[PDB]
């Protein structure tokens, strides 16, 4: 990965089937998109999600989500998130913004 970084760290990630589970993966948000990794070796890239056109936004009321500094990334498909602190949810819901606001 030639890419310069914008951020990286652990994030949970719901899964989309299933029961959907939150899952902890390692998030790198690089070249306008997040990837995400098992780990912070970030050897072997599980999935990826180009970020322009879509809007990330805390805690959709409707959809109900219990875990806290939850935020959504929906693909105007949406993904959910959770950080471990609100900091974090922060630093986070910024950085997305950044990528996928294209004006």
């Known amino acids: 990965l030639g890419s310069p970084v914008v951020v990286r760290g652990w994030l949970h990630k719901q899964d989309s089937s299933g029961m959907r589970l939150w899952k902890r993966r390692w998030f790198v948000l690089a070249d306008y998109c997040l990837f995400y990794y098992k780990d912070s070796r970030e ?3 599980l999935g990826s999600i180009p970020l322009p056109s879509y809007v990330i936004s805390p805690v959709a009321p409707e959809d109900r989500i ?3 500094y939850s935020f ?3 693909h105007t498909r949406t ?3 959770s950080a471990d602190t609100q900091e974090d949810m922060n630093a986070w819901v910024r950085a997305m913004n950044q990528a996928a606001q294209v004006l």
Request: cysteine-free; glycine content about 0%; hydrophobic content about 40%.
């Open 72 to 74: 959504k990334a929906v």
């Open 66 to 68: 219990s875990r806290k």
């Open 43 to 45: 050897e072997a890239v």
């Open 79 to 81: 993904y959910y998130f």
